[PDB]
Amino acid sequence: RRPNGSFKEDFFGSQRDEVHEKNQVVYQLTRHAITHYKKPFKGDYSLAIPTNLYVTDLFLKLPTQSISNLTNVENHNLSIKNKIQHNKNSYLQLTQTSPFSVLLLKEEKRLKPNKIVEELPWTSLPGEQLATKPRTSYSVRAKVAMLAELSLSNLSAKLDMITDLLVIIDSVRSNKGFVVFATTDIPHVLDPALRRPGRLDETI
Amino acid sequence: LLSFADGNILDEPPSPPFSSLLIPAKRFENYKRFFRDTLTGDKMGQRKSQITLLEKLQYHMQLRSIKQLNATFSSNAALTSQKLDTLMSLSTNNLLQNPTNINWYYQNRILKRHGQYLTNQWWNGQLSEHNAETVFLSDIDWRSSLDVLLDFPDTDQYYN
Amino acid sequence: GFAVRTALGEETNFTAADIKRATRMAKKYVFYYGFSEAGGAGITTWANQPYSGDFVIGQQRARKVVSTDAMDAFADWPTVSEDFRFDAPSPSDVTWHRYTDEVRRVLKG
């Protein structure tokens, strides 16, 4: 799927759209969510209808349970989850020179998101000694900046390709005498512009 | 499929994957520090964050080394060393007896903390600009008036 | 929305697009600017100041400035530097009750 969000007009105040356009979007959205459930070509592999999501969660996941009565947890028995995203009965069954040094220090220096942070003595380590420490291990600012940079650089490598894919898929119905099978495993993560008639309709 | 916003900060903006803003994550890191230092510890079974064996060994080794320098250069070794390293071999049996935890407090709340004293605490709100961000982002300087230095703290963060 | 309802005689989804906008403004009327009577004066213990639009992964279009909502955004002074941001501790769901009730009173009037 090539790359709406209202969080811009809540916290960032962008508000770069005319009032009539926003109103029109709202009208069409409510009508679409309510009255296009189970309607051909209009109400389909669409993530704006809550009932489709209910159905997928009803036939694919296991029953979800309610919230808990414990404290220090979020609502369920768990803690708050990260802000930036990078068989057996009992535990009595779950407790079983170049390469050594180079690989130990190689896997020791990598970035670990789930490490807490260490604190400094308010009178920082003396000069040169501080340089022996990776910066991301004693300062929140540096670690968070690194994680943010990683996530954003990874996002910026999507580079939609659906245009040329679309044209070369629409290409093969002007020829004669061959057949094309395109197999996959996860047909729901595909783009809806491929499932449109004339490109990939026959499913098996 | 409807949440009710039970345990969290009331209004929080999204994070770098969507919004390039770094304040929620900066507060989450201190949240995790608090968890590790007060509630859980670092392994299942500890009363809190504890000084490990590897460190109790390194304190011993530092003191041993300083004591040697002194006496030797001013002027029973390898046995202690070998048995100390085979002591180091454990380092993972989590069922060791550590009778007291005052060394953690003495090292992390007196030596790294209120043994000292910070002097940049507050400021009167009437600066040359209408803000503290504008002053800190201004063109020239406003922390000079002998000409002693007068600065202001960053704004405290809260996270409940 | 209230005109459509008073002419047609029946509720519609037009109201849906109004209250949303209105509610946003009403919150800004009570928390950020402090015009209401929440507490005896209008000063509450908490408020949500906007953030600059630099943080977003922005865009660019050939449009003018919006009628009001982008033109009345000239009175805000967002936050720009991250280490001087203030956020009071969130209210306590018994204070939140009274504050959201003030918002409701404004909207109903």
């Binding site: 809550p50 969660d57 979800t64 369920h76 | 916003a5 009331l10 | -």
Partner: peptide, 29 residues
């Protein structure tokens, strides 16, 4: 991108009333 589609931060005393209204709508239908 436990699954949740909506979210609310209204107090509990207003959530009680809102859900009572939803329930009586469903009962009438």
């Amino acid at each position: 991108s436990p699954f949740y589609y909506h979210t609310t931060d209204m107090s509990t005393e207003q959530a009680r009333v809102a859900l009572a209204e939803v329930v009586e709508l469903l009962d009438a239908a």
